[PDB]
Symmetry: D2
Subunit: 196 residues, 4 copies
């Protein structure tokens, strides 16, 4: 069974950048529902597959991608944030960002733009392209996960579903983006980088 991961910090730990009510709902209600529905969905697919019921498998794909995507994406996101975060990364990851995007600040502008550019629900990502051996920014719709739908290894995700910011920032998504840099866990992003 899939389980809702524990957060690495308390619901209020990312204040004032992301408030406690957003965090609490996001984790204990939103992501919990993805986990719960992915478990059901995986079970039904196992049944369909055992019968070679191809129609049923195909019909189940939206719930698997959405709930499974949601689980993947939110599990990464929590590890990407920290009450002890913010600042800039160091070492090879910082040099990679400079190599690939010109500078840390240009990188932030491009990931901000990809994140602000999502029309509707979705995610902005910093990923690693294994075949090209460099960093790459991508946007993903709804809960479509980065690696599963594009092959890029996720390093840093920014959730731009309205539930992730509306209570606090209302429709002003760029304000949310500006604030989240203050809580990025660059230590985590660097581990993800070094692992691929």
């Amino acid at each position: 069974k899939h389980s809702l991961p524990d957060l690495p910090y308390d619901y209020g730990a990312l204040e004032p950048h992301i408030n406690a009510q957003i965090m609490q709902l996001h984790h204990s209600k939103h992501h919990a529902a993805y986990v719960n529905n992915l478990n059901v969905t995986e079970e039904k697919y196992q049944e369909a597959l055992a019968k070679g019921d191809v129609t049923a498998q195909i019909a189940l794909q939206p719930a698997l991608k959405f709930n499974g995507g949601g689980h993947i994406n939110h599990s990464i996101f929590w590890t990407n944030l920290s009450p002890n975060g913010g600042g800039e990364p160091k070492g090879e990851l910082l040099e990679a960002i400079k190599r690939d995007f010109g500078s840390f600040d240009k990188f932030k502008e491009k990931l901000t733009a990809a994140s602000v550019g999502v029309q509707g629900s979705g995610w902005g990502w910093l990923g690693f392209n294994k075949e090209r051996g460099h960093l790459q920014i991508a946007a993903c719709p709804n809960q479509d996960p980065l690696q599963g739908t594009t092959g890029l290894i996720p390093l840093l995700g920014i959730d731009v579903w309205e539930h992730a910011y509306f209570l606090q920032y209302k429709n002003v998504r760029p304000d949310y983006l500006k604030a989240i840099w203050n809580v990025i866990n660059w230590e985590n992003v660097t581990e993800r980088y070094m692992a691929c």
Copy 2:
């Protein structure tokens, strides 16, 4: 020149079903943004058209559908709600709902399902299929408008973007859908329905 239409009522007219903060933000910020981006996008398209720049015409399509669709969808949505709304339609529209969906309550179950079923942002619609001469439910992603993308004539729209309910109902989209039945402007939906039969 497209313009932001005034609401037919004050921001707090739909309380307690849809609160005044949702309404004020929804209209004065969200829809407002779509109107201006629509106008600007249209003017960019006229420039691209005049030069036969097909690449630029295609690059502008996401903004035109998103902002155009948003203007269309929200313009209908406000007219679909009323402080004097709720209850059931009468006449031909109710008999069509019965013939097409079995009963009013079954219709509600089916538009609720369509609306709850949207994964991500989008809209639940009751539409009219002009070719088949009957009612039809459909869901649309993001701001993709009903008639522009499916051919169905919009009768009643239910906005299920999180901005439409999160401040009040948080993740619980079904509680928002339960509530909104209390403020549907069946007079407007009936007007839209009869225009299909004129």
Copy 3:
């Protein structure tokens, strides 16, 4: 584990409406590859499932829908054609078609239009809407199958991938559509329809 069905007729049986070469390639090569890749993908998806590898499950979805759908769609399509086909259906099916589309000619017009209307590869379908209790026309892209992606029960499918007609009709998909009416197996479409009720 899935396998390639035999055609109900010989490769040349639908001449002159759909030539022999088109049929032979379409069944022995195209559909065969969907079956083979379907088995391969199901086998990968069970390993992924067993390990809770959700990323791998999602990465396999395009192949499962494409090859899965291909096997589903082609399998129905062969049974929907016949050398003894054509004309128009009878009884309850014909009554529904008049009821839902006006008349048989209007129906043909509508399914033709939906088929001609696919931009790129895909299929036009006459289906049954179980919830509404009536016939419904839909188009599906690529190999996306009708029931698995829309819930409609397939009754008659028209393949408008270029491999289904190009050898013979080149780009003129309307000529193909006109011709295929001559080989529609209405006894099969009827059977599929009665089974929905």
Copy 4:
């Protein structure tokens, strides 16, 4: 008003790699239809735009992208081929390919894989990313054009619609991909590349 560009060579100029029948049909009928439908759609769009009819504009988007894209893609494609082509590109373009893909052969493997991997109709592209200042491989579905939908500047396109190869190669798209390398117009790809610096 858009027009069908003449080919830079005769219809049998790319024999035996792409046969004359495919070329003639592809240019004189398939591309010509996109030209016509683009003109019509543009004029309908201008009428819609002049009336403030946003529903009408949005309903025309699929025909504009499909036919407009089809015009863009095929116009590039004819210029990307040559009877005097093949081999490896001369100049900076090869050095860029080696930098971005390792070697020419790995580049051919990657564009081949992107092209073979299109499920249904579409295009494989070698593009240039202006933001990153390097080459990038991308696949596009149907006639969605590279620049208009991804921002990448097209350098080399490989049409993998079935009309582009079925008459000759039947379902064996990889055979077509192998053959087309013999007729790439590197002089034209290089012109498009230098235009990106």
